[PDB]
Ligand SMILES: O=[N+]([O-])c1cc(N2CCOCC2)ccc1NCc1cccc(CN2C[C@H](O)[C@@H](O)[C@H](O)[C@H]2CO)c1
C-alpha cells in the first residue's frame with residue numbers, strides 16, 4: 001500500500017508551474033524534459049522592448065505586485081500580475097487534468113487587460129518559449145497552411161521516454177492583431193502568429209531571454225542587409241516580429257503581437273490519456289479547482305475571532321496561496337568545498353582569519369547533479385531551498401496536504417551526504433546559479449542550519465497517533481503507510497543528529513566548566529566577527545570576539561528539539577536501544593541549559609564564551625536568543641525560569657512592541673546598530689514559535705496559565721494585524737516589521753515564513 005500511495009503521489013504531483021523564479025512557466029518533476037516560459041512587453045519604439053520585456057520575477061517601482069489568488073499543486077491555480085511599466089493586468093490560470101501513464105495533462109489561459117492609464121491601442125509582444133532536454137526525445141512544430149505564419153492554433157508534437165507522446169497547442173487567442181501595409185509585409189506577412197524552431201546544446205536551453213534576443217537581432221540584421229532603412233522604416237512591432245520558420249528542434253519560440261486586450265490558451269495533451277484537452281476542458285477544470293480550493297480552505301484554515309471577517313479570509317488565502325504557489329522543482333549541480341580543510345575545525349582563537357585563507361584556496365567544485373522539490377522564501381529575491389526556512393513553510397502546507405509536506409521533507413533528506421550534512425542553501429543548476437553572485441554560491445559541509453523540519457515531523461507524529469482529497473491525507477489515514485515513511489526517514493534523522501553532535505560540538509572539558517554533563521554543549525561553526533549566518537539570525541549579537549570556547553544556547557535548544565522528535569519516532573518504531581540513548585541526552589540538555597546558559601542576574605538564557613583569563617562568562621543580549629529553551633518547548637510549564645521569560649516577553653521596555661516581539665531588547669547596547677537585521681525588527685517565524693508556546697501554557701493547569709493566555713491573545717492579535725495592515729496598504733508579505741512604526745521593511749513577496757500568519761489566525765495548535 002506504501003508502494004501504491006508512492007506511485008499515486010508521483011503521478012498526482014509530476015506536472016506544475018514549478019518555475020517560481022519566472023512569472024509563469026511549467027516543468028515536470030524530471031531533471032531533463034519539457035519546460036515552458038511566458039514573456040511579454042509593450043513596444044512603443046525601436047529600442048524599448050529589450051527594456052519592457054518580462055520573464056524572471058523582480059520587484060521595483062515598475063511592478064505594482066503579483067501572486068497566486070488560489071493554488072494547489074495537485075489541481076493548479078490562478079495568478080494575478082499587475083504590471084505598471086507595461087500597462088497590463090495579466091491572469092495566468094493553470095489546471096491539471098489527470099489520466100494516462102505519464103503524470104497527465106495540463107492547460108493554462110493567459111489573459112492580458114490594459115489598465116486605465118495605458119493607450120487603448122498599445123502593442124504588446126507575447127512569447128511562449130518551449131524547450132526540451134534529453135538525448136533521445138523530439139519536439140516538432142506542425143507547419144501552417146498559410147505563407148508567413150499562423151491564422152489559428154500552433155501545434156507542437158513531441159516524444160520522450162519520460163512523457164511518452166504528447167502535443168502542446170498554443171491557441172489562436174482573442175484580441176486585435178496589428179496589420180502592416182509596409183513593403184516588408186510582402187516578405188514577412190501583414191502580421192500574424194509566428195514560430196521559430198531551433199537547436200542549442202541542452203545545457204543552455206534555460207537562457208530563454210538571450211536566445212529570443214539573438215533571434216530578434218538576426219531579424220533586424222536581415223532588415224539592414226535588405227535595404228529596409230530610416231527613409232521608410234517598418235513599424236516597431238513588425239521589426240520585432242520573427243520570420244516564421246517552424247520545424248523540429250529542442251527550442252520553439254511562439255510569438256504573438258496584440259493591439260489592446262488579449263487572451264490565448266496552452267493545451268498540453270498526454271497521448272496515453274483519452275481525448276486531447278480543449279479550451280472547454282480548461283474553463284470547466286478552472287471552475288472546479290476554485291470550488292475545491294474554497295471548500296478545503298474553510299475546513300483546513302477556519303479563522304477564529306477576531307479574524308472571522310471576509311477581509312481576513314481574503315488575506316489568509318493570499319498569504320497561503322503565495323506560500324504553496326512558491327513550490328519549485330530544481331535540478332542540477334551544487335557548488336561545494338569538499339576540501340574539509342583543517343582551518344574549518346575553528347579550534348584556534350582568530351579562527352575566522354584561518355577559515356578565510358582556506359576559502360581563498362578555492363577548492364570548491366561542481367557536484368551532483370541533484371534534484372529538490374521545495375517551497376521558497378521569495379520568488380523575486382530568494383527562489384531556492386533554504387533548510388530552516390522550509391521547516392516554517394511546511395507547517396501551513398502540512399495542514400493543507402500532509403502528503404505534499406512529506407514529499408518535500410523526503411526530497412530534502414535525499415540530499416544528505418554520507419556524513420549527515422544537507423547544505424543550508426540549495427543552488428541547483430546554472431539557472432539557479434544565475435540569480436546568485438559566485439562569492440556566495442559555495443556551500444560548506446561544516447555549516448549547519450536549525451533543524452526546523454523536525455517541527456513538521458512532530459505535527460505529523462501527533463496526527464499519526466490522534467482521489468486528490470484522498471492522497472492529501474493517505475499517510476495519516478493509512479497508519480501502515482505513515483509508519484513505513486518514518487521507518488525509511490528515521491536513519492537519516494538519526495544521522496543528522498549525530499552529525500550535529502560531531503561537527504557542532506562545544507568545549508566543556510578543556511576549561512574550568514562545571515555542569516551536570518561533560519557531553520552536552522554546542523557551538524555554531526562558521527561565525528565571523530559581526531555574524532553567525534548558520535544560526536539563521538545573521539547579525540544577532542554574539543560573544544565578542546568569536547572564540548572556540550563559545551557556547552550557543554539556541555543550538556543546544558535545537559538539539560533538544562531533535563532528541564524529543566527521535567524519542568517519539570524511535571518509540572513508534574520500537575528502537576528501544578535508541579530511545580534509551582535519546583532519553584539520557586534529553587535529561588543532560590535539560591540540566592546543562594541551566595548550568596551553562598542560565599543567568600540569575602539577568603533573568604534569561606545567554607550564550608557563553610571564555611574570558612581573557614580563560615574562565616566561563618555568560619554574554620546576555622536580551623532578545624530572541626534569550627527565549628530559545630521556551631521557544632523550542634524544552635521548559636516545564638511550572639518552571640520559575642519560564643515565568644521570568646514570560647516577564648521579559650511581556651515587558652514593553654524590552655521585547656514587547658505594539659507590532660510583536662522585537663528580535664533584540666530596546667535596552668541592549670546593539671539595539672538598531674549596524675545592518676539592524678535581527679537587532680530590533682519583528683520576525684514572524686520566531687513570533688510564531690512564541691505564540692505556539694504561549695498557547696501550550698494557556699491550555700494547561702499551572703502557575704502561569706493566565707499570564708500565558710493574556711500574552712497569547714495579544715501577541716496573536718498584534719502579529720496578524722501588523723502583517724494584515726501591511727498587506728492591505730502594499731499588497732505584500734514583508735520579510736520583517738518595524739517595531740516603532742509597524743511598517744514592512746527589507747524584502748517584499750516573503751512567502752516565506754511570514755505566511756505562518758494563516759496558521760496563527762486558525763489557532764487551536
Ligand atoms: O548579500 N545578498 O546577496 C543579499 C541580497 C539582498 N537583496 C537582493 C537584491 O535587492 C534586494 C535585496 C538582500 C539580502 C541579502 N542578504 C543575505 C541573504 C542571503 C540569502 C537569503 C537571505 C534571507 N534570509 C536571511 C535570513 O536571516 C535567514 O534566516 C534566512 O534563512 C534567509 C532566507 O530567507 C539573506
Ligand SMILES: *[C@@H]1O[C@H](CO)[C@@H](O)[C@H](O)[C@H]1NC(C)=O
Nearest residue numbers: 007010011029030371373411
Ligand atoms: C517519481 O518516480 C520515478 C519512477 O517511479 C522515480 O525515478 C523518481 O525518482 C520519482 N520522483 C523523484 C523526484 O524521485
